[PDB]
Amino acid sequence: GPYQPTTVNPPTSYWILLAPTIEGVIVQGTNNTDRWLATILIEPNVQATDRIYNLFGQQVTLSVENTSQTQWKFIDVSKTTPTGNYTQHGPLFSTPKLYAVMKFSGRIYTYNGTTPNATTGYYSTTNYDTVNMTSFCDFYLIPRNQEEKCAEYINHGL
Numbered sequence: 243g244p245y246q247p248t249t250v251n252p253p254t255s256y257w258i259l260l261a262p263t264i265e266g267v268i269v270q271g272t273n274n275t276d277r278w279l280a281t282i283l284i285e286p287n288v289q290a291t292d293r294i295y296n297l298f299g300q301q302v303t304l305s306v307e308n309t310s311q312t313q314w315k316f317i318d319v320s321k322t323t324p325t326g327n328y329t330q331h332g333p334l335f336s337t338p339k340l341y342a343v344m345k346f347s348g349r350i351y352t353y354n355g356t357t358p359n360a361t362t363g364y365y366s367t368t369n370y371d372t373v374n375m376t377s378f379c380d381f382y383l384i385p386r387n388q389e390e391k392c393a394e395y396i397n398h399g400l
């Protein structure tokens with residue numbers, strides 16, 4: 243990398259390492275059947291607030307917060323129908339402002355917790371293997387077999 247913002251359908255067993263700079267929707271993806279997914283970035287020190295986000299072309303109001311005074315915050319969101327409500331999942335508090343996602347074994351793997359001690363976790367409520375990706379930021383590809391490097395960049399930056 244870095245790869246410029248684009249829409250692709252990433253391969254399974256690859257980490258996409260996203261390098262956003264501005265708060266808001268950094269990436270979104272869908273399988274056009276049962277999942278519309280995104281990750282939102284929130285700057286430090288945002289008390290509970292209704293914010294409007296363009297998700298898949300629609301203006302969506304989400305109640306969000308970031309209680310961290312020093313770190314940025316990634317939140318995953320998901321809806322299961324075109325008109326469904328979004329639910330928030332898996333906060334990552336981040337100093338490097340990097341976020342990674344991988345489709346593998348039907349699951350989506352991400353990093354969770356607080357850098358520099360963020361750890362991998364995953365979602366598994368359906369098979370996500372065919373979910374595509376529209377990235378609004380520059381990104382890198384890291385194969386599963388070099389995942390240790392991915393964890394390194396998430397927690398410590400490039």
Ligand SMILES: CCCCCCCCCCCCCCCC(=O)O
Nearest residue numbers: 270271279280318320365366367375
């Ligand atoms: C490579 C795929 C990219 C998909 C783009 C969005 C990246 C974040 C993934 C968020 C998953 C949301 C959690 C789903 C909750 C659930 O339904 O189990």
